[PDB]
From Swiss-Prot:
Residues 116-251 are extracellular. The modification Phosphoserine is found at residue 159. Glycans are attached at residue 200. This is Glutamate receptor ionotropic, kainate 1. Belongs to the glutamate-gated ion channel (TC 1.A.10.1) family. GRIK1 subfamily. It comes from Rattus norvegicus. Homotetramer or heterotetramer of pore-forming glutamate receptor subunits. Tetramers may be formed by the dimerization of dimers. Can form functional heteromeric receptors with GRIK4 and GRIK5. Interacts with KLHL17. Expressed in the olfactory bulb (at protein level). Expressed in subsets of neurons throughout the developing and adult central and peripheral nervous systems. In the CNS principally in the medial amygdaloid nuclei, medial habenulae, pyriform and cingulate cortices, and Purkinje cell layer. Also highly expressed in embryonic and adult dorsal root ganglia. Expressed at high levels in the trigeminal ganglion neurons. It is found in: Cell membrane; Postsynaptic cell membrane. L-glutamate binds at residues 85, 87, 92, 138-139, 187. The postsynaptic actions of Glu are mediated by a variety of receptors that are named according to their selective agonists. This receptor binds domoate > kainate > L-glutamate = quisqualate > CNQX = DNQX > AMPA > dihydrokainate > NMDA. Ionotropic glutamate receptor that functions as a cation-permeable ligand-gated ion channel, gated by L-glutamate and the glutamatergic agonist kainic acid. L-glutamate acts as an excitatory neurotransmitter at many synapses in the central nervous system. Binding of the excitatory neurotransmitter L-glutamate induces a conformation change, leading to the opening of the cation channel, and thereby converts the chemical signal to an electrical impulse. The receptor then desensitizes rapidly and enters a transient inactive state, characterized by the presence of bound agonist. The lineage of its organism: Eukaryota, Metazoa, Chordata, Craniata, Vertebrata. It comes from the Eukaryota.
Length: 251
């Protein structure tokens, strides 16, 4: 059985290789998730075929309980595994299984260096520095559903200034931090990726929430626990660290 692996284009997890050489099948791709998949294949001993998810979505549910994205590929048994920066969540666990996480991350703050600002409190108790998040993304949702006193104030701040505090996308948000007295709330993985490449930017404070990326499988898949095992081995031997450094390290 050659396993079908659903995944999604997302830098630096999954990208097309910058090459016109005759590369076919799995060889067309590179990135952290491709390296992880290669290690998993070698530990477990499986053949695999990487397939980009056709609708280009991670996976969410409609009012009819119908799913899309990589999650739907697994549910429909059109993929054996999903190896991507796919968040392990309560709603997804109802319909698919996940290995234990290969990466743990959380919302944090991206801002300029050399400022007194040190945490989320330093932003909430002031208005001279604008702060927001990518509109309609996981990060904004967190602040909109959070009952944590301090994050309720931040959302009340971001929302009252929806037009200029909530950006269109990461690229826009990053440029906004670079070109104005602005702080962007974004996942720690992305902040790390951007700060490695912009010496003028830095992360502020610690993790605001916590979640992990896991390998998705259909419910009952006999590969799930084996993949967890392999992940732990990689973690313990320092391979996940070197895999992360390989892709994240900048100049
Ligand atoms: N992990 C998410 C998808 N995903 C993946 C990488 C990632 O950086 N983000 C964060 C993100 C991407 C684009 C725009 C906004 C945001 C955000 O942090 O809100 C994700 O939401 C999921 O599983 O649905
Ligand atoms: Cl588990």
């Amino acid at each position: 059985r050659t396993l079908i692996v659903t995944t999604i284009l997302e830098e630096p997890y999954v990208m097309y290789r910058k090459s016109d050489k005759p590369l076919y099948g799995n060889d067309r791709f590179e990135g952290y998730c491709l390296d992880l998949l290669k290690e998993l294949s070698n530990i477990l001993g499986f053949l695999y075929d990487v397939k980009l998810v056709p609708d280009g979505k991670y996976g969410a549910q409609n009012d009819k309980g119908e799913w899309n994205g990589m999650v739907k590929e697994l549910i429909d048994h059109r993929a054996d595994l999903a190896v991507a920066p796919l968040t392990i969540t309560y709603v997804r666990e109802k319909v698919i299984d996940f290995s234990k996480p290969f990466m743990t991350l959380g919302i944090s703050i991206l801002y300029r260096k050399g400022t007194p600002i040190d945490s989320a409190d330093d932003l909430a108790k002031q208005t001279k520095i604008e702060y927001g998040a990518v509109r309609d993304g996981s990060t904004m949702t967190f602040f909109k559903k959070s009952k944590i006193s301090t994050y309720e104030k931040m959302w009340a701040f971001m929302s009252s200034r929806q037009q200029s505090a909530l950006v269109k996308n990461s690229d826009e948000g990053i440029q906004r931090v670079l070109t104005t007295d602005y702080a962007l709330l974004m996942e720690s993985t992305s902040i790390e990726y951007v700060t490695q490449r912009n010496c003028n930017l830095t992360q502020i404070g610690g993790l605001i929430d916590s979640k992990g990326y896991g390998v998705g499988t259909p419910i009952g898949s006999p590969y799930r626990d084996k993949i967890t095992i392999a992940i732990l081995q990689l973690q313990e031997e320092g391979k996940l660290h070197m895999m992360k450094e390989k892709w994240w390290r900048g100049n």
